Design a protein around this ligand. Sequence first.
Ligand code: 8OY
Length: 191
Amino acid sequence: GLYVGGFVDVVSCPKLEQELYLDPDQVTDYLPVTEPLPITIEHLPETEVGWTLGLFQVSHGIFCTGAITSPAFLELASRLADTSHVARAPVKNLPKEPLLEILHTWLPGLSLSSIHPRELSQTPSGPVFQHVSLCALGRRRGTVAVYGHDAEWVVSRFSSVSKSERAHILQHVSSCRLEDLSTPNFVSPLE
Ligand SMILES: O=C(O)c1ccc(NC(=O)c2cccc(CC3CCCCC3)n2)c(Nc2ccccc2)c1
């Protein structure tokens, strides 16, 4: 099981337009979110690879911590990290932890899917957020996603998160066991 952390772009995938980047301040009222949301690849519902453990408002923006739990995805990505020249081409030579470096490089973006700002201004009936996506394109704000084996290590990699914010974040993360989370639906494309 891997952990992922970083600051999200807040998007509401629209039907008419190509993309809509929300200002984080439009959703802070609905944070924090400590119930598990799916983590997918590029907003594709069939690519669940894990679950969020917390969405938090911090000084520097909206910070997300999640767990990558899909066995099919972890096995595939680990094999690629040790054997694929394509996966290793855009990363530094001979990394000590190739899996982490390859996710860090190939999926640097975290995007939080929100309902349209129309309902955010009023009183929403249902959930405001649907999922978080690991993304290869469309990154707007600075900083990139961090992947690691230890949650504390992931969050501490962000100097823009204070000691107080890290302690609040890690309280919820440690309060959840990944065993009683359902298996994500990701299927290896090689099948
Ligand atoms: O079915 C097909 O024809 C097909 C073709 C291309 C695909 N993926 C891509 O083109 C692509 C681009 C950027 C980032 C990623 C994610 C990342 C996962 C594990 C380490 C290496 C890559 N995939 C995918 N999807 C996919 C591939 C590998 C892992 C996960 C999803 C499918």
